[PDB]
Design an enzyme around this catalytic site. Sequence first.
Site, PDB file in Angstrom:
ATOM      1  N   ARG A   1      56.611 -22.373  10.338  1.00 21.56           N
ATOM      2  CA  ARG A   1      56.992 -21.265  11.214  1.00 21.56           C
ATOM      3  C   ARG A   1      55.911 -20.201  11.157  1.00 21.56           C
ATOM      4  NH1 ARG A   1      62.086 -22.634  12.772  1.00 21.56           N
ATOM      5  NH2 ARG A   1      61.977 -20.899  14.253  1.00 21.56           N
TER       6      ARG A   1
ATOM      7  N   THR B   1      53.581 -20.544  19.071  1.00 26.21           N
ATOM      8  CA  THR B   1      54.158 -20.775  17.761  1.00 26.21           C
ATOM      9  C   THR B   1      53.453 -21.950  17.102  1.00 26.21           C
ATOM     10  OG1 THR B   1      55.837 -22.124  18.865  1.00 26.21           O
ATOM     11  CG2 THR B   1      56.433 -19.859  18.321  1.00 26.21           C
TER      12      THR B   1
ATOM     13  N   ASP C   1      51.184 -18.813  27.240  1.00 22.10           N
ATOM     14  CA  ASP C   1      52.032 -18.878  26.049  1.00 22.10           C
ATOM     15  C   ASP C   1      52.581 -20.298  25.977  1.00 22.10           C
ATOM     16  OD1 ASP C   1      53.943 -18.776  24.033  1.00 22.10           O
ATOM     17  OD2 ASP C   1      54.931 -16.959  24.799  1.00 22.10           O
TER      18      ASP C   1
ATOM     19  N   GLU D   1      44.786  -8.600   2.898  1.00 16.27           N
ATOM     20  CA  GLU D   1      44.570  -7.850   4.133  1.00 16.27           C
ATOM     21  C   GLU D   1      43.104  -7.897   4.537  1.00 16.27           C
ATOM     22  OE1 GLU D   1      46.463  -4.361   2.453  1.00 16.27           O
ATOM     23  OE2 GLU D   1      47.894  -4.409   4.128  1.00 16.27           O
TER      24      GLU D   1
ATOM     25  N   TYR E   1      47.624 -10.979  -2.081  1.00 16.18           N
ATOM     26  CA  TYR E   1      47.418 -10.004  -1.007  1.00 16.18           C
ATOM     27  C   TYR E   1      46.001 -10.137  -0.460  1.00 16.18           C
ATOM     28  CZ  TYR E   1      51.112  -7.095   0.656  1.00 16.18           C
ATOM     29  OH  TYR E   1      52.230  -6.670   1.344  1.00 16.18           O
TER      30      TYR E   1
ATOM     31  N   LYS F   1      58.009 -25.641  16.573  1.00 14.07           N
ATOM     32  CA  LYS F   1      58.332 -26.299  17.848  1.00 14.07           C
ATOM     33  C   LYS F   1      57.528 -27.610  18.010  1.00 14.07           C
ATOM     34  CE  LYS F   1      59.981 -22.061  19.994  1.00 14.07           C
ATOM     35  NZ  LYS F   1      59.494 -20.926  20.756  1.00 14.07           N
TER      36      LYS F   1
END
Lengths: 475, 474, 473, 480
Positions: free
Chosen positions: A250, A241, A215, A62, A60, A244
């Site tokens: 991903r 992304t 984008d 954050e 974790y 692609k």
Amino acid sequence: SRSSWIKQLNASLDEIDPEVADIIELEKARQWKGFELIPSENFTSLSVMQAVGSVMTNKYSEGYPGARYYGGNEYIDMAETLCQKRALEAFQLDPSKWGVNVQSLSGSPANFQVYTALLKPHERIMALDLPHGGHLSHGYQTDTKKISAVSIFFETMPYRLDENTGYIDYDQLEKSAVLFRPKLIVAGASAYARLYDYARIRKVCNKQKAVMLADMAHISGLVAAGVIPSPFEYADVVTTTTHKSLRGPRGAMIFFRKGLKEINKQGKEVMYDYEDRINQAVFPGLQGGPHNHTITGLAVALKQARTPEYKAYQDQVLRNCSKFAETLLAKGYDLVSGGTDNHLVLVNLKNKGIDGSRVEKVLELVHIAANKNTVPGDVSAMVPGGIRMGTPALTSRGFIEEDFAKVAEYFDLAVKIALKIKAESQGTKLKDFVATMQSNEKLQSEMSKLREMVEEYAKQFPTIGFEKETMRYKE
Amino acid sequence: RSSWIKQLNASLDEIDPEVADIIELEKARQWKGFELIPSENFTSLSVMQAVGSVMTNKYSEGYPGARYYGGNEYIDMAETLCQKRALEAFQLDPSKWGVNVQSLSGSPANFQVYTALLKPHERIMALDLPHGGHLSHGYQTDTKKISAVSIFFETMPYRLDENTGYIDYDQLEKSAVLFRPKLIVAGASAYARLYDYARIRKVCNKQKAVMLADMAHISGLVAAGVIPSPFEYADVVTTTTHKSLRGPRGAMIFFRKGLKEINKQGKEVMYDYEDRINQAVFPGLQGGPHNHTITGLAVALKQARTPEYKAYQDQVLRNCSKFAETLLAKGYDLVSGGTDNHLVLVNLKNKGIDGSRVEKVLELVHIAANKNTVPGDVSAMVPGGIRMGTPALTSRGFIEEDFAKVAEYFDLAVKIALKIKAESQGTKLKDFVATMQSNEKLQSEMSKLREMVEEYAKQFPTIGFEKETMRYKE
Amino acid sequence: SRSSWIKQLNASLDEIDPEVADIIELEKARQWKGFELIPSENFTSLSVMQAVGSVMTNKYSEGYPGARYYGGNEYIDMAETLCQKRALEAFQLDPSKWGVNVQSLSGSPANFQVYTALLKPHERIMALDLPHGGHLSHGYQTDTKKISAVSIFFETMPYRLDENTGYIDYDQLEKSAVLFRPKLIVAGASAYARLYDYARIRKVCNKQKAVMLADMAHISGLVAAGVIPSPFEYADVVTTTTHKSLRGPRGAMIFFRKGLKEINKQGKEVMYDYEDRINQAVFPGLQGGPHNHTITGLAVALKQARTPEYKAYQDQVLRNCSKFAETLLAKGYDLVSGGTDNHLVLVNLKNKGIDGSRVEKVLELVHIAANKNTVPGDVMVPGGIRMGTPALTSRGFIEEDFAKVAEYFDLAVKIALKIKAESQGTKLKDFVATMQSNEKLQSEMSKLREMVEEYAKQFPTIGFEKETMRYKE
Amino acid sequence: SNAEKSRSSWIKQLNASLDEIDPEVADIIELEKARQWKGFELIPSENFTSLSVMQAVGSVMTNKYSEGYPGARYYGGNEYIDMAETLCQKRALEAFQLDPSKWGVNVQSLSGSPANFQVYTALLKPHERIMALDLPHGGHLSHGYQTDTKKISAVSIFFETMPYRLDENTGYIDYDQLEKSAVLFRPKLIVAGASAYARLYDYARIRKVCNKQKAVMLADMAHISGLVAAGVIPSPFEYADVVTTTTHKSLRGPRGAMIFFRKGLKEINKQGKEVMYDYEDRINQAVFPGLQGGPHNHTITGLAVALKQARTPEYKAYQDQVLRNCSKFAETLLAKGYDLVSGGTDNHLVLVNLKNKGIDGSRVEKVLELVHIAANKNTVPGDVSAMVPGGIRMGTPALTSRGFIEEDFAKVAEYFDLAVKIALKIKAESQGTKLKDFVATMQSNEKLQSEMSKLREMVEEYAKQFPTIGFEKETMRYKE
Ligand SMILES: [Cl-]
Ligand SMILES: [Cl-]
Ligand SMILES: [Cl-]
Ligand SMILES: [Cl-]
């Protein structure tokens, strides 16, 4: 007992879950045997997959490197800092002029995080209309329903293609923007085969004092390799992304200008005001713990994006698509905008007398993966008149121009079978087409023969991310 | 071309030795430390192998058998299997419960529920963040809306009973009468007690509000049946798939479906959650599912059914009970006086030192914990407590006497932090850090304690990789 | 044709529209012969009415004095500026600390204009719950529907009475405000017989950094006369109607702090930031051309509000209400909060075994005009009756007269109870059918109506001459 | 006996005349009466109210609280207020020849701007979309307005607005671009309503666009409602779903507003179900309890009077004269070399484009005002900024009410032209070129001051000859 759950945690997938292992083996064989033509798909490297499948998932973290809430993040910080550095390097960006956030979980939330950072609820966004090649994460509503939640929380209005040319109508975009007063304009598309006029968008955004968001999800690998012009020359913010055409895991990245923007009338410096807002929208605004396994794999993918072999790959993507387009046109197909300047083509099937839903059903049965697509002139959104196909995935396997000439041939043979199924169907509904497609022995045989042709052609090429010799399903 | 194909198939060691080395350093860190952060766990090799598979290559927007892309025969198998196993893991009747397995993580899962069921600016109540809540339920300070949930929706907190440390359900009920929430969240992060789900249900019924249980911290305990289940009462249940479930990083959204209770049938007789939630996930807010994560999630959910997994979660609880008892006997105050789950909340006020100082010493001796706001704190920036839990070390095989040792080493670290404070010149944290870094004597004390921690932790199995092939064996 | 429309434009109402002239004569007779007890009603002066009915209505004057869009506004500017300055004088305000807008068309849009000026859409407002004595223009929603559009465009949450005492529960208001974080808190009521604890509201607004809006519509004439405590000591903004107890034309005023607010921790002056926002919300935000006839009549009303006889009038309003309350209590009625400190009382009829709807139907038939009111346990028919003294005090009713008003009210309640007992069904429509068909109870109502009318007729008419009325019988 | 002396004093105060109570205010009104006697009032939104309307507005009807609707009130005493509001509703439908089974009306809205806001609140959710004519092209603030600086109208705060515009080559609304814009913007409501526009609406075309967009068609007829009532121009009620209007301006009533709305069958849908109009309850509830409180019954009563006047033959003759006067005014301006936006007029006003005269609207408006001709500067196609208007707007309703006929408006145009010639002399005598240098010359040039003084006396001597409307000359305080 304790020895027993420890053994379970360290056993292989083959031992623990044969059903899931079998599904993955079937998917490996599918990726070996098929024409993978969906232009958003690619085959990621083994090294990226090994990083994504690593114990970096356990942490974790954050916050941001050097500014975490949890302890224990010395090496997670190394990975995220390395990823940021390589992200700027992959697009040849000056780190004093550009920053990046690598924590956004995928392309759709990345855009929503930019809107949340820079726009109040119900403020105005313009973007390419979804049936004209836009993306749901830029907004979309029908006559009766808001489909994308971007159109629920923000006020969206589309810009459209020139119906005659198939290119974005920039003149109408500009005129529309005067009336609508967008606070942000998106320059990015999914099903668009031409290069964006980023300079023109920049002029409209300057006049409107709107944020220019590029984008580049579909084209980011082409941009990184330098084989098409870069949106970073003009944009304020760039989302993408990481899968692609970039060929990474991903995930997503958000790039933004930072530092000095301009000098005011009083000789005082004016700084860009994107970085803190975007980083805070990602966390604590909208996400929680970063996916460090994905960020680590992204760092691997961004190093690969710098190599000469990666540029050779992206150049081949372009040349393959040009030959693919040329061959489709020679076989009588119509392309939206008449051709391509990037990695995909948009086939408008109207002149062939059959829709994309019927053709895609045949394509699926002969192991050609594509997707049906709305085209200009379509009446119903649920009856798409087109098929979208592209070259990134099979180029990754080593297809070259003559191979995509054969792909176009096999596509054409599938369309001809679809036309035969339609001519044999009693009714005109799609269920009548499907019933013929499943009861006609002659046409089933033709589909079986074309399936064997496709598989025989695709199987000869290397597999990406795994070796052929250890495939469970070779037959 | 043969060149770029070779680079696509080469190992991480060959392609990216810098990244490979970072992962080896992280493996050693997970081997040698006391990992006490209650939201952390160690995932199985089999989950990691699925997440690291070619399932990542597929675009599959939509739902099984209702896709927009071709080629999804086997991705459909994986998502359908994942859904089936998700319902089985929580013993749910599939005619009464549905599940969405595509939400990318716990925070957007909750936002997708709000988007599905609430209009913009409609009202949500949830436990206050410094009282044990979570940012994805909303959060605003005096000066700023911190969570974007509080931007797009109208939020109001409910609070603990400061005297008992349990949620003040009486105040929640009265507060809800005036605020008229459309949705009430029953879910916590830093909370050591079981939720009164029945009481939340009663309030939600009176308010005609959706009852959302967010069980991220406790979902593995729920799956094993060792604590009561929120599914007995809730309308919708969200969870992370990591944390106590011990799966990949991801999320699930469960929802009632089918016929409503007899007394709640009206214009519609069926629940109206499934379509709205599935549509909020896609096409509303996400794009392509992450099929590598979904496939790893299927693996984790099969593991969650096993007797070994139930033994593990039983051990998590018994370890935390023993841990709490040892801390109490060493003089530490616990918020609510104890625990009923996987974590404890230490209030350091009776020791004359705050959580920020103690956490810095803990980090230096390879004990991972979290500073934590305690009832009575004057500022949320200066936390007076420490949060610790048992899932991660229990996965490595720590049992009760091992957590007695954990509490001993925690206590020794607090004693070191108290010495650093006594030797500190000023009263500010930068003076504490200055002492902590320059004092040779106390630097030696932390080194010795770090060695004790690592020597103890190294004796236990590594989870998800082999000791024998680690790069860093010292 | 030219001479034809000129004559029409200059003809009297009697000549042009006898039907409307007759309606007005019927209404004059109604105001002469009845007990007008609705606490928001009053009788406006002739001089105000003459200004409201003047050619000041013809000019378009968007903008503000000296800053108009159109020419020709020299004399409209004299009137609006005079109105503004008289408005501050009527409440003894320092014009370096207070400004005023006199263009708002009525009390309800005045509040909406303040919210629009100072709050973004969907920001949070607290105010007294409507069935606890609040007002629709502060927001209101039921379980199933947003009723006031304030609650559509803004996020509202009520505060409530201590239903044991009938006073506002300021303790719960303060605790609620911590959780709800209002950006603005309204201190203002309609059906409330007690004075506001403005100091306590100020303390809560300071803690929450919320705007304190006092809405004094019901009590502004009492405030102007200096006979109850003023909200201006505490509030950031004050709205009011110009009718009701102020006794002016139908309209509204918005007052706001201006100038220096305080010194911050850095030694810097921080100024109030209400004036431009409020003026701009009124125009160009939400209204167009000012109603200069109403503004001119308002100037007249504000001059009257300065005078000693106006103060004597408002002191009599209070003493009349106290006597009215004492008499009702002596006759066995329960009052919400037990009494009054202002111009109205709230009668809770539950101890008498009958509701406010049934009683108000009898009151209407005996020429007593009153309002209804909810009481604890309500919602169905309301359990209470709302009555006040401003209107009849304007006609010269004094304490012994309101003792008589309370006697006749009690006689009406006794008739309502007889109708309820004779009604053989339990529904309101059964009550009405009995009330309309029972010859004996119709006789009792006719007698009480005659008693009310005989008592009221002897007092002066306000705003018109008795001797020239059409309906003198 | 001080208490009885006080009571007598406050009763005396309430019953005394304005002359006795407030001579300062009475004096202001007398000055305004003199001003209305002496000027050329060419602002097309202004008019002169009848005595009978003012007598009702200044009546004891103001004293009554009557929240709710006739026969559906919340408390007592409203028998005669109900008669007035019911009579007003009946006369409102009659004034526009409306079938009460197909049209309802709300007469409580306090003025034109809140009336439109009440319609939006009734029919649209917050942030839903409205299109309307752009303010500088003839629109109105109450339909929304935003500049490059900020949102000006609060309609644009609570709802999402977008303008439609003129074809600046023709001066008419560009309906083709409106339709194309609406496809992209998806309005939920389209306003067909103009102020500074010399043409009438193509309501049939707006109707077609609203039908295609499933949008409410709101006609805002404030500037033209008296022409509509008189039947001298086509009616928006032939096409619109909802019609708002001021009750002042060309209707010539009190300051107030009306909201009309369709009732009954909208269509039978494809499934064979009747779709009824859903406007009446939503609009009436938006007015009360949504946004307003107690009705202003004095204004409603005066509105009833104005609506009875609107049905008379004399009122029709008046509105015909408004149109004929405007045409004669336009003829005379064209003959004197002026250009009119859109080339002419179909209504009660003209828009003069001053560019070919070599002077702008600010300068001409200032000179006009000094000679007591009231007009308003107006943006024209080609203006560099909305703050530098190139035109001037003038209309006929107010002076037609005083009895100006065609030959009188030929004289108004002559005096307008004389003022333009003075403005050009002031410009040619000005040191600099900014507006302040113009104002400086205008206020210190003794010769040009004398020319304006002479023209003012010509204007006033002409205007004074006509009847005063709503008061008598014989009792005026100021008779020179
Ligand atoms: Cl695609
Ligand atoms: Cl935690
Ligand atoms: Cl009242
Ligand atoms: Cl005008």
